[PDB]
Amino acid sequence: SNVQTGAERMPHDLSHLGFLAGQIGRLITISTTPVIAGDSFEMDAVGALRLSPLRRGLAIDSTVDIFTFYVPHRHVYGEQWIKFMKDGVNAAPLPTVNTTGYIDHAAFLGTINPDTNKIPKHLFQGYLNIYNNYFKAPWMPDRTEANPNQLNEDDARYGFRCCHLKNIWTAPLPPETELSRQMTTSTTSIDIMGLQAAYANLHTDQERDYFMQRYRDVISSFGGKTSYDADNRPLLVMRSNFWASGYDVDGTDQTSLGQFSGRVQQTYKHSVPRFFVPEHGTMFTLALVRFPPTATKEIQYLNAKGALTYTDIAGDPALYGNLPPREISMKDVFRSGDASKKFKIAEGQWYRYAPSYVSPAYHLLEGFPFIQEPPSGDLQERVLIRHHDYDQCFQSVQLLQWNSQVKFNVTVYRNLPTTRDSIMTS
Amino acid sequence: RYRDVISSFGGKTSYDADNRPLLVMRSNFWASGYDVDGTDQTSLGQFSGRVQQTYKHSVPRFFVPEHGTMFTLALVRFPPTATKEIQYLNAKGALTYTDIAGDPALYGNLPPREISMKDVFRSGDASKKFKIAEGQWYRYAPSYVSPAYHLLEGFPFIQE
Amino acid sequence: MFQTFISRHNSNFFSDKLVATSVTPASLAPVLQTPKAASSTLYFNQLTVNAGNGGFLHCIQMDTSVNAANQVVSVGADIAFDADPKFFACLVRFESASVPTTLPTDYDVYPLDGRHDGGYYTVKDCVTIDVLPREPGNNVYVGFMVWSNFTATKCRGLVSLNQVIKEIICLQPLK
Amino acid sequence: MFQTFISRHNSNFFSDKLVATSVTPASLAPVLQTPKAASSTLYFNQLTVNAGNGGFLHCIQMDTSVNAANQVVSVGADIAFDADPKFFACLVRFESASVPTTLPTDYDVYPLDGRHDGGYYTVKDCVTIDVLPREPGNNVYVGFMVWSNFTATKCRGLVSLNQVIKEIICLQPLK
Amino acid sequence: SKGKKRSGARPGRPQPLRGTKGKRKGARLWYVGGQQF
Amino acid sequence: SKGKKRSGARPGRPQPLRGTKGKRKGARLWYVGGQQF
Amino acid sequence: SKGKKRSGARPGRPQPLRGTKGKRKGARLWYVGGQQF
């Protein structure tokens, strides 16, 4: 009888809808699709972004980010792949991972939880690779769970916490920078040629602390290049950003005459141009919603430290360009800050940055997404976003803090037989 | 159907030979509208949708050959979206070469595959079976509904 | 005139009889029947109350499907004692790691506007309560409690509790 | 000041006298008069109550012309007993394949906020109820029921029931 | 990082979603045994 | 099937129905014995 | 006094504040050890 060995190249629809929801400052998966080696991928996403109804009207916009990444299966399975592909049919099946038994767990991966509490390993591990290479601070430790059921709630139902927009206290120098370095000398002598060699060792250490925490950064400084296969990192295909706006509604009865309520609704588009898929893998699409980091109790540095010296106030170029970094506390920038929490800044940074001012009359007032109290804990706890800081800004609904409805217009050019060829023997 | 068998030979059948009604016209459209905002103390921040659509059904001049009746009928539907649907490759357990490789020599020469409602739904029944074509998971993509939408008024979905 | 169409309780549509014939009030207040779901109506045509100091109650479990901190809980009750056991009624919130048979030592109380008349009591009210477990790995129970320095007497009536996590639809002829 | 123009009962405009002189409470609670339509007012200037445990009630039939699952049913009552027969009052829903004379063994109860005062009772309320037969080939009846451990006594008053399937129009001078 | 850094805001109103799939049609997908409307 | 597959959506507002009949008049239908207004 | 006496009223609607800083960029300010998104 007739045996088919090849196919022709045709476009495939693969379009679907998007009823999404999430929290603020957490990275959640929006869409996912498998691809084959040799394909071409295209996507237009058109939708609307809404926030929960506000308590008093629109005051500050929020910014929204959409990302698309490509993750090969060889980056996840490694050597179990390759052997799988070389053996062809009759190869051993690929492994899975375990999840907690609920419906809303494994929702940060953009799927409903199966009744068996098992999902493909490449879905979970492909999310960890994106977070560890692009979204955590380079000086933080990596995250390695091996099983989605080892996470807690708010990590399984919603994504992982991300970082604030850069600021004086949300973007400090890494907590490993050295404020001094010693050189061993004799009792009544010093080698001045070895002193010259001690400055060259410190220069390489300071570069590896401010710019070059990752291997791909070290190679780039020499003038070289690394492919994402050499580093085993995902490939960023597209990125979009916008601000979300809306309007107000006026109350008209006896009690609410003079009261307003804000309604955020924004139309957006995420477009990915045609992309050649070199190996089998997955495409991820993710979203992130954030606010500018405004706090009600922040003060200017020169107004908070006690007595002004020449180094603070003069702005002398010979002094700012030759001094080590300065270590300060949370008490120097916040009214109720803790004096035992320290971080390091650059000298003269108070003449390069200006903070926002919030009047004392705004303290503890509903609506108005601010940070009411100075953040507590170690450095990593302060830099990451706490979505409980925005609970008093919205009204309680079932759809969390933001929701979206989107149509994904995907198109892939594959080499597959038609449905007719698959069901007919001859 | 008999009219399908004759058509494959290249022939034709009149609707008198089959004893079937004659379709004269067909129309299709999507229905839209707008929203109304609540303005009192409790409903400030609440909205309600109002669907209203203007349409036209036009039939051109038609010669009636024998005594009979003309019927006009209507049908209203929603796209079939469910809150508990999963992708096939994410729901079946361990991926084999036939599932994942997308090999043309294998999809074009194999018999159809029989699966269950447990393979596409979270609370599906494993004793309910149906047949699909091989490789159909690479030709179709389902819609995704977040778990936060489960059991929420409005939003016409299929809950179970 | 127009019809009101706004209410405060919204009962369950299914009522259950009390499988019991007596209760003994105590500081560890006994639960009348096994708690269930987020809505329950209990009626009893005859209940014997033994002498004791403390109270007894009827409760329901809290549904945690929706991640909202504060929710509204309603009550509608009607009790008739044969004597006049001077008592006060309230709403009680407590927590337990297993199915409870009494009231633990840690709990909260809330006031609701009833209609004491001497042997008689009626109420139909709603109160906002924080419904999340407040301590990991625990269930939250909310009940209707009666407390007094009880003597031997008898009572009859019905109690209904409801947790507002969904809305009820009704026919409106003009809309 | 302005006029309210919103209410909770909306009585019938036609009232009927009770053709009976005595009732005997029982677990199979007797029906006072033959049920009718979707609205009925019953007044009685003199009714003799014999000793017995259980209750008695006044009910109406449910109209099934409109295919809506849940509908609102109203009540307005005013009863005066000579003695103080400690009792509780409720709304009862039941089903029957023929015209009923007593209360069957399967039924539901609902709480309504009345004004017990000892021999006296007054109420004016509305409750949402599922009105469709819930079992093919049956009629649904909703009534106002009084239950106690009755002794020999006497009562007077009136009871009115209404099913909200249409709206009532009234004159508004400004509109 | 690599290659995107684009933007996506549009003006107007968020019209309701119309049709679950369809941007460009390929070949047939479903075979029931005839026409079905 | 045969011959239609058309479409019918129009923009605007749903104006109320005006006149029960009448697109094109033929001959007289009713005879009462004179004029009636 | 000296030199101002200007005016500042504009027509329109008070659009919400968009971005805390930024009218004209200079040099880099923050160094974390790589890119952070």
Side-chain angles (χ1 to χ4, degrees), chain A residues 27-141:
Chain A
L27 178 78
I28 203 165
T29 312
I30 287 320
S31 185
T32 285
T33 179
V35 281
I36 314 180
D39 288 357
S40 292
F41 185 83
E42 209 170 12
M43 158 177 256
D44 301 359
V46 183
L49 196 274
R50 306 175 192 266
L51 297 178
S52 300
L54 287 170
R55 296 201 190 187
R56 57 176 48 248
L58 305 189
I60 320 173
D61 283 6
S62 55
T63 179
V64 185
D65 270 305
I66 317 286
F67 313 89
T68 307
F69 290 90
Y70 162 63
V71 191
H73 285 158
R74 189 180 31 81
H75 286 188
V76 168
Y77 300 107
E79 206 71 21
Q80 191 164 5
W81 194 258
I82 296 181
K83 186 185 192 303
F84 178 87
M85 289 309 292
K86 277 164 66 176
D87 292 10
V89 82
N90 288 325
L94 301 164
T96 65
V97 289
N98 305 326
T99 61
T100 319
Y102 296 72
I103 181 182
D104 37 0
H105 283 57
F108 70 106
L109 298 169
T111 176
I112 296 294
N113 198 26
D115 184 1
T116 57
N117 300 334
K118 290 179 178 61
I119 50 172
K121 174 182 163 57
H122 71 263
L123 210 57
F124 173 60
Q125 186 65 54
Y127 180 87
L128 288 178
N129 291 343
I130 298 174
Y131 185 79
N132 279 333
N133 275 270
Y134 298 98
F135 286 94
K136 83 176 208 305
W139 53 264
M140 269 166 230

Side-chain angles (χ1 to χ4, degrees), chain B residues 59-128:
Chain B
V59 186
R61 189 175 294 194
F62 171 71
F63 174 76
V64 181
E66 293 183 21
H67 299 65
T69 315
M70 326 282 312
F71 291 77
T72 315
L73 303 102
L75 179 59
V76 183
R77 292 187 283 189
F78 277 116
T81 303
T83 61
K84 283 177 173 180
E85 189 171 354
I86 322 173
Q87 297 183 22
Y88 179 65
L89 285 186
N90 297 333
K92 62 163 309 176
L95 302 186
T96 64
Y97 183 87
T98 311
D99 300 332
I100 197 74
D103 196 31
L106 291 181
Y107 287 165
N109 295 293
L110 284 199
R113 181 185 286 190
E114 180 179 47
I115 67 179
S116 51
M117 299 300 291
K118 198 174 177 297
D119 288 320
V120 287
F121 281 98
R122 164 171 174 82
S123 295
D125 184 1
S127 56
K128 306 297 174 180

